[PDB]
Amino acid sequence: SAVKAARYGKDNVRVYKVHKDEKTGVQTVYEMTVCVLLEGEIETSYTKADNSVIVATDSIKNTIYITAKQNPVTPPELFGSILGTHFIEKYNHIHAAHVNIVCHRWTRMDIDGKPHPHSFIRDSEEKRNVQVDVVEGKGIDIKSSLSGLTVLKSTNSQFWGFLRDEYTTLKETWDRILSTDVDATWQWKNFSGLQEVRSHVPKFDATWATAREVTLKTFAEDNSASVQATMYKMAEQILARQQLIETVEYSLPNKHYFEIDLSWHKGLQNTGKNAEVFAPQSDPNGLIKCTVGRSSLKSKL
Amino acid sequence: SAVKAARYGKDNVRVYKVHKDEKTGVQTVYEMTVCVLLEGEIETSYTKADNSVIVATDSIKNTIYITAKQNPVTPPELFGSILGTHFIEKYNHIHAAHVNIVCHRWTRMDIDGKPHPHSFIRDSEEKRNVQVDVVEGKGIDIKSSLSGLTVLKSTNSQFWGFLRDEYTTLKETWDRILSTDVDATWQWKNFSGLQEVRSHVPKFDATWATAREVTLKTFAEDNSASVQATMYKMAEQILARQQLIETVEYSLPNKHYFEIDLSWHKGLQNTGKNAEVFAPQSDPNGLIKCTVGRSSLKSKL
Amino acid sequence: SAVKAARYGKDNVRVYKVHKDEKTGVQTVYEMTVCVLLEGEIETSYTKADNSVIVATDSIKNTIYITAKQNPVTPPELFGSILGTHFIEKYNHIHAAHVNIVCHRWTRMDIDGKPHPHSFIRDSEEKRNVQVDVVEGKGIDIKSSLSGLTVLKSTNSQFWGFLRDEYTTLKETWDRILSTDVDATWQWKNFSGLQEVRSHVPKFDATWATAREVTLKTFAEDNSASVQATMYKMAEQILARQQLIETVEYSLPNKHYFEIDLSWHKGLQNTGKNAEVFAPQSDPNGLIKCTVGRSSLKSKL
Amino acid sequence: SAVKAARYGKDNVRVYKVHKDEKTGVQTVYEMTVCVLLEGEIETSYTKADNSVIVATDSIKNTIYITAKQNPVTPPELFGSILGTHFIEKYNHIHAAHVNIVCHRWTRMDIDGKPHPHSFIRDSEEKRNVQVDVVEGKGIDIKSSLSGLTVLKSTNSQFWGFLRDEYTTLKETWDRILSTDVDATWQWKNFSGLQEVRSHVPKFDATWATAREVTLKTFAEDNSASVQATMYKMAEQILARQQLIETVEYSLPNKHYFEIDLSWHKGLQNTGKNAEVFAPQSDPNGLIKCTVGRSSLKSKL
Numbered sequence A, B, C, D: 001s002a003v004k005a006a007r008y009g010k011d012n013v014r015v016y017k018v019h020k021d022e023k024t025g026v027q028t029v030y031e032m033t034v035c036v037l038l039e040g041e042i043e044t045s046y047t048k049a050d051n052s053v054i055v056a057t058d059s060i061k062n063t064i065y066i067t068a069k070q071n072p073v074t075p076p077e078l079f080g081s082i083l084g085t086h087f088i089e090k091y092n093h094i095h096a097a098h099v100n101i102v103c104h105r106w107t108r109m110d111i112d113g114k115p116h117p118h119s120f121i122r123d124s125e126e127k128r129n130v131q132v133d134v135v136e137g138k139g140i141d142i143k144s145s146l147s148g149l150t151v152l153k154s155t156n157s158q159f160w161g162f163l164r165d166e167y168t169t170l171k172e173t174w175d176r177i178l179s180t181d182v183d184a185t186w187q188w189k190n191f192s193g194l195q196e197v198r199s200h201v202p203k204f205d206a207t208w209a210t211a212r213e214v215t216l217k218t219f220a221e222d223n224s225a226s227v228q229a230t231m232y233k234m235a236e237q238i239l240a241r242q243q244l245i246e247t248v249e250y251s252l253p254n255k256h257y258f259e260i261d262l263s264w265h266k267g268l269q270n271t272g273k274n275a276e277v278f279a280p281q282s283d284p285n286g287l288i289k290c291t292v293g294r295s296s297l298k299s300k301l
């Protein structure tokens, strides 16, 4: 037997950081959950009880907090890159660091129409995430995402013209509810190292903002032929607006809202044009995925 | 043996309703989860296998949807009162209906600075709830609440002067983080029936808005001596602003954020005035409760 | 305004304890989650920022661990009674202690047919719980329970003869699935204090075992007329087997499994006697409750 | 822009099946949650609003239930293979089917020491899973797993000899608690199609049983040098016992239980040899992974 793959580290490391402007009194907070998993010449910890090669997971935890003390934690793409780079630079025998960060929302409160200097609300469980893979000799691979963005539109969604055979019972519709939880990921061009990441720092917040804006506006405005067709439009727009992205991925549940036929009760009409009351379905759900990149086809387009 | 208490019905009934203004095109959505439990002369279903006294839970479910089709679902205090009243009026042998409603947020999207006519975002997992107990011969008892309102302030919270004995290790502090999930409940004066509830309908949304506003502003502005002292101020203000409330209850976790001493590492200073990076604690948590009403003491105040 | 009710303390205190028999090598583990909330002359912490009356929640936490170090943690009824008694005895101004304990399962592993001396499996998320209310001058009120005991029977459940009117669509059935999550609570006679609790210590584990045994055997063997009828039989049996119990409460969801008509596809027969494949329903669910005590009726029985 | 990857289908499809032996009266139940995602010539549903290429997710759902009606649902490796094969055979333009199955435990109750013919208990939230990828022209790739197997040992775990530098605070230990949630995956040799899967059917249940047995016995008996060293022993044993497995993967959290120094209180000794009461830590947690295969090194072993 032999070790074909191995990584290890610390998961679920909750981290808060505050910035205090002593001049203005304005405080700003950041909260995340961090995972760091390391790879390298560690196989003998598994095969030979050789712990000398293990940077303790507790030490990885300490290092996350120290790194947060000594560096900005925003944008998370930068913080993850700094953190991952540290492990491959500090430890000769560690050759990859895999850093996942979930950023939690703390949005400044407005009180009597004025932004409060030190009070915040969790205005959504929507997350902003990164996955930063720092691989010695192969640079820094970053996937950025937003997730848990839950939306619904009450009309201007359709679904007809799908394949019909002996397994099909679904009625075509020209007017339905569409609701989903948006998970959208943009994959950056490979960066050669931390310097290149730093050189693009403003692009991280800007591209997250673009992705969120495009998602919301396209969802709201597209008279949707299908989840497939709508999500493709989102992805193509995001690619058009940031050339340093290589791909955009969406993963979207179709969270079904079923009509309720009430005509058995006093002839009540609650279907089609008269549909007002619906039954949200917890499960099952459609699940629709795609990864969109830029075309290289020059014939048969 | 004998039945000392019994209630039964349907829980976790998910309900959506849409309102469509055909003139303007503006659609408005409502989503809730409903529980209805009935009491009455039902003991023989338990003791004698006498199902004749059971209004099937499936029928209770049907009735929830029918009631939502035939009535407004807002404010939830009204919808719950209509629904509960139905069961005690329709069925001679049913003498109480207990209606719990959780209202889910669907906030209209703004797209390019304009409110969208039919697209919505779950802008928070904060809920607005009601508990409506319709008891034949004893009117309608309503508790209204907001829950899952998660907030944090980064300073202007203190905790000192608490009891110190041989069980005490906690250091006094004059500057800490305070974070909580607000569960706030206001208990209405007993209503004699559905007519009286209807007579007060505008007060329901108004008092929910007041409770939320007072909660947020007091949290943000109180230089807090303790969770106890801050929550009391919230409750007293809400009581002062709605005379048809009898009590206000708060239940508040103290979701601790611990300082991290890093002085063992290169003399890094991250405590007291230099505290920037903190460890959010998932558990344990303080839990602080009180119910505030109006005073009737005339001496020894 | 005035404080009508108040309690405060520490929730979600995770506690593990090990017992080691040094002679035999056998180790035994206990794990729980504890909440302690105190009441007393504490109103001025809310009204006057008077923290002198507050036993810090952190100190309550310390006290939970110290109490676990100095006392058995089993049965939980005893541990909770010791813990609650401590607070009302130690602090003159504290007049009630409310102790909730959730006990987590760590069942000893059998390895090659022999019980292992120090290895355990979480063999179920079923819990054993207590709620111990220690009230100065009014003794110790204990509710014991089992919860999260999830069961299913594939036949020998029926539901017919229920009320049928214009709200009813449910078909009568003489053969259905019944599945539930059992929450069963037995309420003890008031105890005068810790001595009386100690005097009954063996009864706690014995009555929990009885409740669990009766629940399982009655569920398995009753050709059930309804959830109502089956749960009543459980409760009456438990009352008959422990005279120091005053009431038994059950709260049971009816976790529905729906037949799936497949006759639209190649005439497949999957209903009634030919029903093999079912759709488990996550929501909604029936919810059936009752509290059973001993009868005092001497006429009209 | 162009579609680089796409798959879509139905997730969270809950399925129950009963088998009834009419001779003996013994009934046996199976419950799972199923996801099926399809790939193929479907890009135009995304790019051109061409729904003709979409087998509706609702139809995929219907097909899951029909397949369960017409075939055994056990072992899940077989059921998933049948289900995935159906989609690539039925639809010319569908070229892959990805079938994930989570199997839920329904263990037959013993009542008065005898197995009950139709009553079951959810004896653990441990799952048995499969991931079956049916790819036209490339056969059937199966990963089998067990997950959510939660275990603890109270001694015979150690962790010393790890790297120590300026980031290290963790004390070496020669006696600690070890607790984890076991996620173990065995990856089968590629199968050429459904016939080859059928030819190995008995191996599926047998290898799951082996994996579970090896996991439990190794956990219980290994005087563990680290999570790394223990998990490697598990994997190598499983590989040795089934030649049709290519790799075994473990993913194991180290769910920490911290000692509690109580020496500040009355000199109580609760560390080292006197450690009895511990604080289970919800987060953070170590996370340790490896994939083990068979060696092909012939020099420098």
Ligand SMILES: O=c1[nH]c(=O)c2[nH]c(=O)[nH]c2[nH]1
Pocket (backbone or CB within 6 Å): A159, A170, A225, A226, A227, A228, A254, A286, A288, D008, D054, D055, D056, D057, D058, D059
């Ligand atoms: O937008 C949709 N896409 C699908 O692939 C699908 N399948 C289905 O049942 N409903 C829908 N809706």
Ligand SMILES: O=c1[nH]c(=O)c2[nH]c(=O)[nH]c2[nH]1
Pocket (backbone or CB within 6 Å): B159, B170, B225, B226, B227, B228, B254, B286, B288, C008, C054, C055, C056, C057, C058, C059
């Ligand atoms: O505001 C607080 N109230 C308490 O009762 C308490 N107890 C504690 O440990 N911290 C705090 N903080």
Ligand SMILES: O=c1[nH]c(=O)c2[nH]c(=O)[nH]c2[nH]1
Pocket (backbone or CB within 6 Å): B008, B054, B055, B056, B057, B058, B059, C159, C170, C225, C226, C227, C228, C254, C286, C288
């Ligand atoms: O056992 C049951 N009790 C009910 O009260 C009820 N109501 C219902 O719809 N199904 C059932 N089943």
Ligand SMILES: O=c1[nH]c(=O)c2[nH]c(=O)[nH]c2[nH]1
Pocket (backbone or CB within 6 Å): A008, A054, A055, A056, A057, A058, A059, D159, D170, D225, D226, D227, D228, D254, D286, D288
């Ligand atoms: O078994 C362990 N492996 C590690 O890699 C590690 N790191 C750590 O902090 N504790 C442990 N324990």
